[PDB]
Ligand binder design. Structure first.
Ligand SMILES: *[C@@H]1O[C@H](CO)[C@@H](O[C@@H]2O[C@H](CO)[C@@H](O)[C@H](O)[C@H]2NC(C)=O)[C@H](O)[C@H]1NC(C)=O
Ligand SMILES: *[C@@H]1O[C@H](CO)[C@@H](O[C@@H]2O[C@H](CO)[C@@H](O)[C@H](O)[C@H]2NC(C)=O)[C@H](O)[C@H]1NC(C)=O
Ligand SMILES: *[C@@H]1O[C@H](CO)[C@@H](O)[C@H](O)[C@H]1NC(C)=O
Ligand SMILES: *[C@@H]1O[C@H](CO)[C@@H](O)[C@H](O)[C@H]1NC(C)=O
Ligand SMILES: *[C@@H]1O[C@H](CO)[C@@H](O)[C@H](O)[C@H]1NC(C)=O
Ligand SMILES: *[C@@H]1O[C@H](CO)[C@@H](O)[C@H](O)[C@H]1NC(C)=O
Ligand SMILES: *[C@@H]1O[C@H](CO)[C@@H](O)[C@H](O)[C@H]1NC(C)=O
Lengths: 296, 125, 248, 108, 108, 125
């Protein structure tokens, strides 16, 4: 492909996650209930790394990814996931090109700077080879426009037990250089029945550079308490281990706590290291004398 | 690593007798069985005799019944084979095999062998 | 395929008929864990996994939950909570060659026991000691893969055996692998015995336009009792209310 | 009685070939066969006891198989020190320790 | 080696009789025998694979049995389209695919 | 329902060569093995050759070793048999059988056959 070196080197920034990153954990319908669940969630008020100019380096994939972007001309197209991405390990590719949404699992031959060039979209220099293809999926064709910000796109990617689950949400926004404070639920989009081993990924960007900046967060196993409204839409949630007040809310299974004293949990010191103490005897007893005997 | 050395081979006239010995030193001799295996000059191997760990059960090959008498001495770790009334068809090569078990007629095979000793039955010098 | 490279197939969107498998006498071993084989027709399964390989006759017993051995620990491991069926039959008619069929491999040495339901394909030279192999076979460099010497003259225990294992998983997803059951028209406002994708029970069906369920298949209550379902044939939301009862 | 036969008599191969030798019995012996490697210059040695059990201390190149009435010995690598005469012996019937005829193996 | 023999050569029967044909092998083959129906005017067809397994698509009138060294094929009804020559084949020994001699079957 | 049609038969002088072909269209040809079966004018059937699903393992009948060379073409769904150095005892009828398995020497037998093609080796018109 083509190597781009006109990129200023800057340390990654950070942003407050606030109350972003809550999805529907199952396919059952509940309403007017407070349900306690244990699932991989983005912690509230967490530390979210922020990138930018063209910037798309290799990013780790520990247990899940919260990918959030805000643009006005649909500059971002797709993503690449994998472990080595050099025809040695199984890799994934999602591209929402000008034609439709295409997903491939074939083992490609990736260069070090995959990107698309364009207003008409002409350059296609992401990969060179493709062999041992296993899965392929194409969505219905559609025309996608190439030209503060206006909308937010939030995506959640998790890979559990051979299933690749994707969640998404598009919402209007009046902010320019900040992550909004508020709550919004994320409906599930696609469940891919493909068992890839993912530890690394990289995003696509699209010679003139446009205004594009995205945030990345990470999900970890946390217990949450979720409030369903009359219509079954999640409108509020509580991180069960954020602070003692949230722990009290979990214990009472309610979002309102009255004045008083409550018991929440227990305190226990954890061990540091293991200790083994055995006698100093060293002589192998003869199991062979009783096992390798000619006559019983 | 076990050693099995034989002696007593040579040339005798037909109808004469000769004795063989086979000394074992690399293993425990008091609880294993032993056999004698004959190899013709231009044929395959052939079993001859065998003795148990203690001299209770003794068997002989069909062609050598009533002529050969195998013995055993647990004290000096050696066995013997007295060959009597030799004919012209016993000019073969004799080995001193070791049985894997303790009996004579068992599915267990011959585990360790030894270099053969050459005998000859003819009228010459 | 070989043991170390056992093949796996996805099974979904099925009018699945298990009667032909059970009634056939061609399978020497047919053991199901967690499900009675005779009831397989009625159940509906979310997704079906099929794993196929060929093994030695002595090692068919090792394909079972909580079993230890060379092949269970190093080639194919079954979880202790496995649910599904295991099928095995003799394959001397096809996988035996007089000169030796060496197309099948199995793993001998690996660093540690593998987790259940995972595949290892690497052919790196095993390091049993301290001297690095550096990619060269020799002393202290043993190839982990060994070939079965299948021949028509092998004993009954050394005969090649073809093993196909089917695993069923059930969870909060719309079932897509069902059995051969004819669907009947539904009746509303009457205490009936419904059966929606195997979710049997009883109650009074009622048109519930109040619920929405944009993408949810089923609804439920405080206890493990369903409160609303969607008709698989025509997609609308139906409410379930239990029949009246009381003391006398 | 029982009869023991050897299908092959003289074989030719190279340093990097594969050789199989078969031994056939007149009656069923139930996996009770033994294979011996007889070097022409020293004492013969046992390789395989039982149908397919390999004795300790010998290379794993030799591999035996078979049960019932027909048996077969297979060698995988043919190292150049593997020239000898091989015999198959039964230890199951009334005629004790019957040996089959020789099977000369030369490499060329 | 292996030898394959056919006890019967020419048989006579009627439309409503029962006919059995036996095939004998020199050595044990362990239930590995096959029976073929060779029409004189067309290509021969297989009836029984294995010792007593009947191939799909052929009438159940043909029935085979036997194991070890002696085998036998039995026909129950003798429909008048069953005139042909039948061969028995072994697929177990070193001589590959040995065919026995023919067995003519005429109805009178 | 599978079709196996052969050609190339006729009459040639002794010592001359001729080639055979056999086209298969009723089944999947890329993963099955095939054989060639000879039927003497006044004798029983006799096996001649066989090839695997892929051209790796090839075996020949004892009487035809060093003379016949069987081939295979997976692209056009057809196999060939080049007959070289014919003598007077090869005036028989040749079939194109299909193996049940994928290898050459297996307990599996010949499943589907085809009508034979007649060859003749003599000096005539
Ligand atoms: C773009 O940069 C990459 C490195 O980031 C180049 O890859 C190198 O290719 C040379 C051969 O041309 C190898 O010797 C190096 O080992 C490669 N580097 C790495 C890190 O793998 C690539 O060639 C560059 N492409 C262009 C068009 O300049
Ligand atoms: C006594 O029995 C034990 C039980 O296994 C034998 O231990 C191993 O046996 C294998 C078989 O050949 C050898 O390869 C190992 O080297 C043995 N282990 C050790 C630590 O030596 C043991 O060999 C038997 N005793 C004898 C003399 O054979
Ligand atoms: C994120 O981490 C950096 C360094 O660990 C720290 O300086 C910063 O305050 C953190 N931000 C938040 C919002 O916790
Ligand atoms: C495809 O899989 C085969 C399986 O043996 C492997 O040999 C080959 O290298 C693979 N190709 C690529 C491009 O990974
Ligand atoms: C995934 O890859 C990493 C490193 O490439 C490896 O350590 C891990 O075992 C792999 N896991 C699976 C399930 O393949
Ligand atoms: C629920 O939906 C109704 C319309 O169906 C709407 O009037 C109401 O405001 C909604 N309430 C909530 C909490 O979403
Ligand atoms: C699929 O379901 C619809 C529901 O309206 C029904 O009309 C149709 O007949 C079904 N398809 C088949 C093949 O029966």
């Amino acid at each position: 492909c083509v190597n781009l070196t006109t990129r200023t080197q800057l340390p990654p920034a950070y942003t407050n996650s606030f109350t972003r990153g809550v999805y529907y954990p199952d396919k059952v319908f509940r309403s007017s209930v407070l349900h306690s669940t244990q699932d991989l969630f983005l912690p509230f008020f967490s530390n979210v790394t922020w990138f930018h100019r063209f910037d798309n380096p290799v990013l780790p994939f520990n247990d899940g990814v919260y990918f959030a972007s805000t643009e006005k001309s649909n500059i971002i197209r797709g993503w690449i996931f994998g472990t080595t991405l050099d025809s040695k390990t199984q890799s994934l590719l999602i591209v929402n090109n000008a034609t439709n949404v295409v997903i491939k699992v074939c083992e490609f031959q990736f260069c070090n700077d995959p990107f698309l060039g364009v207003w008409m979209e002409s350059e296609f220099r992401v990969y060179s080879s493709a062999n041992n293809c296993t899965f392929e999926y194409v969505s219905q064709p559609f025309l996608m426009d190439l030209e503060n910000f206006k909308n937010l796109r939030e995506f959640v990617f998790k890979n559990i037990d051979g299933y690749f689950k994707i969640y998404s949400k598009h919402t209007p926004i009046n902010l320019v250089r900040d992550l909004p404070q508020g709550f919004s639920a994320l409906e599930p989009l696609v469940d891919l029945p493909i068992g890839i081993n993912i530890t690394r990924f990289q995003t696509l960007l699209a010679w003139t550079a446009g205004a594009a900046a995205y945030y990345v967060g990470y999900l970890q196993p946390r217990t949450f308490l979720l409030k369903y409204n009359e219509n079954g839409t999640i409108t509020d949630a509580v991180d069960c281990a954020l602070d003692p007040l949230s722990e009290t809310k979990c214990t009472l299974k309610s979002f309102t706590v009255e004045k008083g004293i409550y018991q929440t949990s227990n305190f226990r010191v954890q061990p540091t290291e293991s200790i083994v103490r055995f006698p100093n005897i060293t002589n192998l007893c003869p199991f062979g004398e009783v096992f390798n005997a000619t006559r019983f | 690593e076990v050693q099995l050395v034989e002696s007593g081979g040579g040339l005798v006239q037909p109808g004469r007798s000769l004795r063989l010995s086979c000394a074992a030193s690399g293993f425990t001799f008091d609880d294993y069985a032993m056999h004698w295996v004959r190899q013709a000059p231009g044929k395959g191997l052939e079993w001859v005799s065998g003795i148990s760990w203690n001299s209770d059960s003794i068997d002989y090959a069909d062609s050598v019944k009533g002529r050969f008498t195998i013995s055993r001495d647990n004290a000096k770790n050696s066995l013997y084979l007295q060959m009597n009334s030799l004919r012209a068809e016993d000019t073969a090569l004799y080995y001193c095999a070791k049985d894997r078990g303790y009996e004579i007629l068992t599915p267990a095979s011959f585990d360790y062998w030894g270099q053969g000793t050459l005998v000859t039955v003819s009228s010459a010098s | 395929a070989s043991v170390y490279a056992w093949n796996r197939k996805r099974i979904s969107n099925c009018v699945a008929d298990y009667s032909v498998l059970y009634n056939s006498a061609s399978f020497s071993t047919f053991k199901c864990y967690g499900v009675s084989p005779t009831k397989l027709n009625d159940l509906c399964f979310t997704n079906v996994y099929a794993d196929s390989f060929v093994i030695r006759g002595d090692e068919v017993r090792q394909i079972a939950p909580g079993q230890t051995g060379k092949i269970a620990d190093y080639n194919y491991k079954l979880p202790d909570d496995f649910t599904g069926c295991v099928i095995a039959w003799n394959s001397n008619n096809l996988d035996s060659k007089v000169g030796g069929n060496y197309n099948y491999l199995y793993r001998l040495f690996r660093k540690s026991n593998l987790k259940p339901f995972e595949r290892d394909i690497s052919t790196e030279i095993y390091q049993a000691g301290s001297t690095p192999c550096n990619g060269v076979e020799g002393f202290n460099c043993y190839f982990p893969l060994q070939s079965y010497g299948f021949q028509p003259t092998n004993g009954v225990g050394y005969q090649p055996y073809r093993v196909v294992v089917l695993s069923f998983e059930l969870l909060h997803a719309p079932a897509t692998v069902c059995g051969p059951k004819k669907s009947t028209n539904l009746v509303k406002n009457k205490c009936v015995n419904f059966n929606f994708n195997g979710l049997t029970g009883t109650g009074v069906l009622t048109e519930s336009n109040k619920k929405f369920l944009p993408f949810q298949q089923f609804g439920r209550d405080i206890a493990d009792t369903t409160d609303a379902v969607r008709d698989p044939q025509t997609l609308e939301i139906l409410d379930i209310t239990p029949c009246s009862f009381g003391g006398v | 009685d029982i009869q023991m036969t050897q299908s092959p008599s003289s074989l030719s191969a190279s340093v990097g070939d594969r050789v199989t030798i078969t031994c056939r019995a007149s009656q069923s012996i139930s996996s009770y066969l033994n294979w011996f490697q007889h070097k022409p210059g020293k004492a013969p040695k046992l390789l395989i006891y039982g149908a397919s059990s390999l004795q300790s201390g010998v290379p794993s190149r030799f591999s035996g198989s078979g049960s019932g009435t027909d048996f077969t010995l297979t060698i995988s690598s043919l190292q150049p020190e593997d020239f000898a005469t091989y015999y198959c012996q039964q230890s199951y019937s009334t005629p004790p320790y019957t040996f089959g005829q020789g099977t000369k193996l030369e490499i060329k």
